[PDB]
Enzyme design. Structure first.
Site, PDB file in Angstrom:
ATOM      1  N   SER C 366    -101.876   1.506 -28.889  1.00  0.00           N
ATOM      2  CA  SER C 366    -102.513   0.069 -28.904  1.00  0.00           C
ATOM      3  C   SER C 366    -103.944   0.100 -28.394  1.00  0.00           C
ATOM      4  N   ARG C 367    -104.740  -0.046 -29.244  1.00  0.00           N
ATOM      5  CA  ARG C 367    -106.330   0.448 -29.004  1.00  0.00           C
ATOM      6  C   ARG C 367    -106.933  -0.828 -28.396  1.00  0.00           C
ATOM      7  N   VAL C 368    -105.934  -1.866 -28.353  1.00  0.00           N
ATOM      8  CA  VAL C 368    -106.212  -3.444 -28.001  1.00  0.00           C
ATOM      9  C   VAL C 368    -105.479  -3.402 -26.437  1.00  0.00           C
TER      10      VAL C 368
END
Lengths: 62, 50, 501, 56, 469
Positions: C366-368
């Site tokens: 989850s790059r967020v």
């Protein structure tokens, strides 16, 4: 015009009215009202059982 | 209720085939001629209004 | 009856057309017509072929404008006239789409009467700019503890659900929709996510089962179902995500938060492939036309957390891509991977292993990140990531089955229990307020001791126990959403007390 | 109510443990549990006892 | 409609006609070229303009002379349907190729028929038990469902279907449709004989089965519309008769394949692997014309010849999408000698759920899956180093799994000739019990050979005694 003529003639001159209930009955579930299935009865009436249980049941150790 | 709804659809498709019968009647008549005249003059009025 | 009023309406449609553009069909076949004429013709325009077939127009050529039919060509025939609608494709958008299944052109296919529409919108709408966007700060809880912990979902984020064919593929997404019942039922409009489930390429029976499932959990009272079944035209399938997007935008525009599941985009690519190759466009890489990336990207970039000047609007997206044979280097999977802000890799082997939901935690990112993770849940799951990572390394060594040292087996024992902790029953998400305790217990190693077999029993019982005694505590976890010292101590004591059951 | 009956029921199961014998006590408890659980599921099952002559 | 034409081209079995009058048939109309080979039926597929259509030819095109007179039959080919179909083998055209002369026609219906609507759908929930242990245990079927098989065709694939016919269709009774697209003619003759023998076809009496057969010798184009024809026969039962049917399709790879052949000739830019671009649509349309409406429930069985047994191939892949349950049967498991050769880690049904078949069934299945997956996991380690070099705990699992693998073989009565072992059908209730015991290792104490090629748990116990002697 042609729309009106087609509309007028078809609609006016062709009238339907719903089908009889008898035919409908065939196509649906008819239903005859459920009866009372059961009338309960007295719960093991008579002290014959009771006297037996009172005397018999003890199961106490030394 | 289910058969009632079905019957409405059945009535509509029955009455649809009557539209087909009526279509054959209109295109048979010299309404086939007379409404072409009506369409013709309507195009005259319309295209002149352009 | 109803017929007389319908006929009256039909009579009530008259009035000549001036047909300012005409053109004659000539080459028509494969459902892709090409008409000669149409000197005026907007691009992406909707053109009504005279046969009651409507087709959008995607290629304008200095000979023959190539109008892709939305119907079957068994109603079209050579030399027909086509009359340009004069409106680029548009859909009704409104509140009434809530609780309705609708086809691409917005006809209710569940036939719950005409859509109550507050507007119409256009299929292509440019994505929210840099300026009208504010940073994500609003959690979205899927009620799958592993998902919430490992790959937290926020609003305006795009996270790709990727993995092998229909490994309850739809079901992974459906769980998220189901957990949104808790807030949705709630009257907190600042926690209301109206949910739009988009189903592309699935058979009518599949869709029907899904809508039934949604009705069973009585969640259809907040769902919009946009469907484009496999029968329906390849152009309509191509247009189907973009018209779903606009439907979402009405919510987004209202500032109301929403979530759009795009299941499965993989079939959009097949559709665009068919469409392009019968528009005779040069074959792209891996036969998917080379502008598929642009197609998918423009679609995906329309979900965003709009700025606070834009009333904190937020459409959230969850794309779903089926990987054919798990090939992650295939052109369509590669393209999507880049576009999205997360990967939620589902692994078949782990599914078979009985880890359902199945998530290969290494191939999931989850790059967020945990900016959208619940603050409490961040504290508890702090070293959960480390433990799992250690478990993975340890497990690899363990395969060789060399006599493992105690440090390796501390990890191994802890890890095994964690895996069992993650598992959850499909079609039964769990409340986050009651997922925070379970993770606390695991992370504070109380479960590490508890025998692997009875972890499942323990989990059930622990919840019952917390419901019995520490229901004051549970209320606090919901209410304060950050575990304070007092909460941490209360929770620590509760867990300790429940160690021996 | 049903819970009062059952609180005394389960209290006596662990009491019958205390003194010798309990060979047929749990069978008494079992009959009561069975039918008590049946009526509560019945009472929750309870549909409207009449058709919708208003709506339907 | 009598529209004369001449044959402009004969490029394969994709003849192009050039109508000389300005009345032009629409797409999916049908034309008859009358020849000393009788009529040849062609179907309009493109309009290429200038009063020149291009037509797929559903009969062989050898001998055609360019410019040959054509006449347009008009509209989609209309097969003849009724109950009079039952007890006939019909050709693509609809000719009675079982030579029981003219079929008594009621309604003759167009081959192309739009798939029923979203509203018309009715979702199933029925359990249909086949008495095949592997099916019952791993992925129960349902009445109205779409059942799926994958692997080498008629390498045991055909046999599997035959076993299904033997079990399900006598119990089911009522109308049933067998449609065989591109099957081996001799195998079809065997089926015809067998059906007549088992009285399902009773030609003296009435037949509650109808048959459509398309031989693999039939031209590719003919094979393309064998399927559509069969679906029409099914629709008459589904809709008009409104009685639950059955449907068998073997192979639906032939449907896709046939399309790919004609596609090239038609003039389409080839899609990946070479498949037709209209692959998705054609498969989609076909598979939505097979469905359970509120009008009727049609259990369908679809057989997919996976080419080279690569599931990643786009035609099998898109098939996997439209099926409701699949039971992929793997060549490897065939090599292991397990007949039925269904891969046990590659089967699925939406009917395998702990609600649908209850928690106890689901629990039993869960353990089987876990055990077998472990066994698959340790396959590397097993090969590189001995099983004795696996952990003791694992060795119990491995031994159990080896037993489960052997246990899963169920002799089939249709395969009685081939196996040489009398077939056995085991109850669904019995199956759950049998596996439950094995999973608890109750009967794990007797050889793997005891579990090999034998039926239920009781049979295994007895077979241990047989071996013990």
């Amino acid at each position: 015009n042609v729309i009106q003529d087609l509309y007028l003639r078809e609609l006016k001159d062709t009238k339907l009215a719903p089908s009889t209930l008898q035919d409908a009955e065939g196509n649906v579930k008819p239903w005859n009202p459920p009866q009372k299935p059961n009338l309960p009865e007295l719960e093991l009436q008579g002290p014959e059982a009771l006297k037996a249980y009172t005397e018999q049941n003890v199961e106490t150790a030394h | 209720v289910r058969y009632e709804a079905s019957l409405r659809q059945l009535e509509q498709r029955q009455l649809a085939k009557s539209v087909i019968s009526r279509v054959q009647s209109e295109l048979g008549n010299p309404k086939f001629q007379e409404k072409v005249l009506q369409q013709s003059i309507s195009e005259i009025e319309q295209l002149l209004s352009k | 009856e109803v017929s007389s009023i319908l006929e009256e309406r039909i009579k009530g449609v008259s009035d000549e057309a001036n047909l300012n553009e005409t053109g004659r069909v000539l080459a028509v076949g494969d459902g892709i017509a090409r008409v000669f004429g149409l000197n005026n013709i907007q691009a992406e325009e909707l053109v009504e072929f005279s046969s009651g077939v409507k087709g959008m127009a995607l290629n304008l050529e200095p000979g023959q404008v190539g109008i892709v039919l939305f119907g079957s060509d068994r109603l079209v025939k050579e030399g027909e006239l086509v009359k340009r609608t004069g409106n680029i494709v548009d859909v009704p958008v409104g509140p009434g789409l809530l609780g309705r299944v609708v086809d691409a052109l917005g006809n209710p296919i569940d036939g719950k009467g005409p859509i109550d529409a507050a507007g119409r919108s256009r299929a292509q709408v440019k994505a929210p700019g840099i300026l009208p966007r504010r940073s994500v700060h609003e959690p979205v809880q899927t009620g799958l503890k592993a998902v919430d912990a490992l790959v937290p979902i926020g609003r305006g984020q795009r996270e790709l659900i990727i993995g092998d064919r229909q490994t309850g593929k739809t079901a992974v997404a459906l769980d998220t929709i189901l957990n949104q019942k808790r807030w949705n039922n709630g009257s907190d409009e600042s926690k209301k996510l109206y949910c739009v489930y988009v189903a592309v390429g699935q058979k009518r029976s599949t869709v029907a089962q899904l809508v039934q499932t949604l009705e069973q959990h009585d969640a259809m009272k907040y769902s919009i179902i946009v469907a484009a079944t496999a029968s329906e035209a390849a152009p309509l399938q191509y247009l189907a995500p973009f018209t779903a997007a606009s439907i979402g935008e009405w919510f987004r525009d209202n500032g109301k938060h929403a979530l759009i599941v795009y299941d499965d985009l993989s079939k959009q690519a097949v559709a665009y492939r068919q469409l392009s190759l019968l528009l005779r466009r040069p074959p792209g890489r891996e036969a998917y036309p080379g502008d598929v990336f642009y197609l998918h990207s423009r679609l995906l970039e329309r979900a965003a957390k709009l700025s606070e000047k834009e009333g904190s609007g937020s459409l959230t997206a969850l794309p779903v891509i089926e990987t054919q044979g798990g090939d992650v280097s295939a052109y369509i999977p590669t393209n999507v991977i880049s576009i999205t802000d997360g990967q939620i890799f589902l692994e078949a082997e782990l599914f078979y292993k009985g880890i359902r939901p199945a998530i290969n935690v290494g191939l999931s990112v989850s790059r967020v990140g945990s900016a959208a993770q619940v603050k409490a849940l961040k504290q508890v799951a702090g070293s959960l990531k480390l433990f799992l990572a250690q478990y993975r390394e340890v497990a690899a060594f363990a395969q060789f089955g060399s006599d493992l040292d105690a440090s390796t087996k501390q990890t191994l024992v802890r890890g095994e229990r964690l895996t069992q902790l993650l598992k959850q029953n499909q079609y039964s998400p769990l409340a986050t307020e009651e997922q925070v305790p379970l993770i606390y217990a695991g992370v504070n190693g109380h479960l590490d001791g508890i025998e692997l077999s009875r972890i499942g029993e323990f989990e059930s019982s622990f919840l019952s126990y917390l419901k019995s005694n520490h229901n004051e505590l549970l209320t606090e976890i919901r209410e304060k959403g950050e575990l304070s010292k007092e909460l941490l101590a209360s929770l620590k004591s509760a867990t300790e007390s429940f160690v021996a059951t | 109510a049903k819970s009062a009956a059952n609180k005394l029921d389960w209290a006596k199961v662990i009491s019958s443990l205390r003194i010798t014998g309990s060979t047929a006590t749990q069978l008494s408890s079992f009959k009561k549990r069975n039918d008590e659980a049946r009526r509560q599921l019945l009472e929750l099952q309870s549909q409207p006892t009449e058709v919708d002559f208003s709506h339907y | 409609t009598p529209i004369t034409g001449k044959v402009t081209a004969v490029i394969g079995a994709i003849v192009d006609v050039h109508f000389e009058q300005s009345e032009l048939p629409a797409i999916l109309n049908a034309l008859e070229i009358k020849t000393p080979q009788g009529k040849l039926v062609l179907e309009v597929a493109q309009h290429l303009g200038e009063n020149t259509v291009r037509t797929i030819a559903m009969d062989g095109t050898e001998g055609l002379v360019r410019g040959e007179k054509v006449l347009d039959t008009g509209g989609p080919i209309s097969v003849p349907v009724g109950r009079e179909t039952l007890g006939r083998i019909i050709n693509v055209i609809g000719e009675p190729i079982d030579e029981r002369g003219p079929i008594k026609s009621k309604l003759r219906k167009p081959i192309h028929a739009d798939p029923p609507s979203f509203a018309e759908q009715s979702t199933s929930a029925e359990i249909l038990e086949t008495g095949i242990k592997v099916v019952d245990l791993l992925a129960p079927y349902a009445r109205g469902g779409k059942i799926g098989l994958f692997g080498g065709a008629g390498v045991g694939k055909t046999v599997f279907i035959q076993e299904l016919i033997n079990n399900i269709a006598k119990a089911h009774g009522g109308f049933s449709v067998f449609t065989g697209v591109g099957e081996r003619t001799r195998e079809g003759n065997d089926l015809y004989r067998e059906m007549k023998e088992t009285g399902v076809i009773n030609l003296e009496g009435e037949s509650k089965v109808a048959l459509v057969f398309g031989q693999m010798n039939e031209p590719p184009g003919a094979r393309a519309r064998v399927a559509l024809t069969g679906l029409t026969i099914a629709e008459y039962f589904r809709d008009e008769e409104g009685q639950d049917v059955l449907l068998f399709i073997d192979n639906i790879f032939r449907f896709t394949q046939a399309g790919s052949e004609v596609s090239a000739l038609l003039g389409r830019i080839p899609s990946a692997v070479g498949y037709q671009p209209t692959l998705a649509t054609d498969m989609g349309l076909l598979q939505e014309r097979i469905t359970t409406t509120k009008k009727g429930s049609v259990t369908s069985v679809q057989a997919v010849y996976v080419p080279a047994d690569d599931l990643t191939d786009p035609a099998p892949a898109t098939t996997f999408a439209h099926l409701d349950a699949t039971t992929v049967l793997s060549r490897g498991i065939s090599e292991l000698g397990i007949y039925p050769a269904v891969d046990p880690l590659d089967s699925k049904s939406r009917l395998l759920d702990a609600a649908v078949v209850g928690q106890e069934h689901y629990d039993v299945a869960s353990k089987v899956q876990e055990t077998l997956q472990t066994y698959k996991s340790l396959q590397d380690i097993i090969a590189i180093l001995g099983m004795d070099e696996l952990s003791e705990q694992d060795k119990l699992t491995v031994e159990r799994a080896r037993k489960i693998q052997r246990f899963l073989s169920q002799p089939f009565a249709v395969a009685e000739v081939f196996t040489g072992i009398p077939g056995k059908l085991v109850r669904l209730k019995d199956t759950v019990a049998s596996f439950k015991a094995v999973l608890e290792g109750k009967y794990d104490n007797i050889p793997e050979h005891a579990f090999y090629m034998v039926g239920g748990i009781e049979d295994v116990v007895a077979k241990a005694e047989k071996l013990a002697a």
